[PDB]
Symmetry: C2
Subunit: 176 residues, 2 copies
């Protein structure tokens, strides 16, 4: 018996710094997703990792989750696992921060969503947001990683760098 | 013409509402949130958030609220689905643990002390009590389970079972697994 439980992956002392917490998160995601390619499973645990990591970082986040490119027709993002309050069910590519990340295949960092044309708010209290797209081997958008913050300008290049790595791990470990 | 509401508002209500009001409001929110699509991931993800916040406001110290769904490839195995809480076990075999037994017996399991539960599979070592409600198909088979963990012993009772079994039926009719 290791003495550990799955839940233990989300322990981060206030004494750890940001680089460490995020490094541990990637490693935990790797350990937890090694066993199955089931994307719901891996993304669900992934959302918890992200949520808890950010709560430990003292970034006041209110949502941490994923939308996945709908299996049906013309690219639409459909709500996937998340930690946080009830969210919008579907987003068309090109619409809002998530839809913009999906059409551009690029990371979006929004310092104030009320000054962002076309913003699609799922939580009225969200002030800033970061969206990182999950790209497949053939370079198509598979879904996005989306984090909201209750304060303006909550995210920067460090979050983008970490999230982009996590998106790579996700594509290599999940089957959509 | 903005309604002035946001999706998140389904989980924004006073904790001064009594339990029957809160649970009845949850069933109504799930219905309105799931009307537009049969996608089960979307529907169970918002569901997990509804359940989590309802119990937080009822002042039950829960640590997990979520779902497991029967693996398509194998109808005797549960695969981790959407949830609110800490990282959890990825797969559970029918007949094993509280979740696996709710699935094999097709009966709600209300557990006051998880460590007195033979074969308990702890995803969170701090879980002390738990309730698992199986989601049943028209065909009468287990589609998955609704799973809630609590940090204190004796956190659940049959009113929870009654409302969660209604929710499970709404999930079956609203989702395509
Ligand atoms: Br849209
Ligand atoms: Br504007
Ligand atoms: Br694409
Ligand atoms: Br990759
Ligand atoms: Br209210
Ligand atoms: Br009651
Ligand atoms: Br098992
Ligand atoms: Br009681
Ligand atoms: Br009902």
């Amino acid at each position: 018996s290791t003495g550990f439980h799955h839940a233990d992956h989300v322990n981060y002392s206030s004494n750890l710094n940001k680089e460490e917490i995020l490094e541990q998160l990637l490693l935990s995601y790797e350990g937890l997703s090694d066993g199955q390619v089931n994307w719901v499973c891996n993304l669900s645990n992934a959302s918890s990792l992200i949520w808890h990591a950010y709560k430990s970082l003292a970034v006041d986040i209110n949502w941490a989750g994923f939308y996945v490119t709908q299996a049906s027709e013309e690219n639409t993002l459909i709500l996937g696992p998340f930690q946080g309050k009830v969210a919008c069910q579907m987003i068309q590519f090109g619409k809002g921060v998530c839809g913009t990340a999906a059409s551009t295949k690029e990371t979006q960092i929004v310092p104030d969503v009320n000054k962002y044309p076309g913003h699609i708010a799922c939580d009225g209290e969200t002030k800033s947001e970061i969206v990182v797209p999950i790209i497949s081997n053939d370079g198509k958008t598979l879904g996005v990683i989306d984090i909201d913050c209750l304060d303006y300008e909550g995210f920067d290049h460090v979050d983008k760098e970490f999230l982009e790595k996590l998106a790579k791990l996700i594509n290599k470990s999940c089957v959509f």
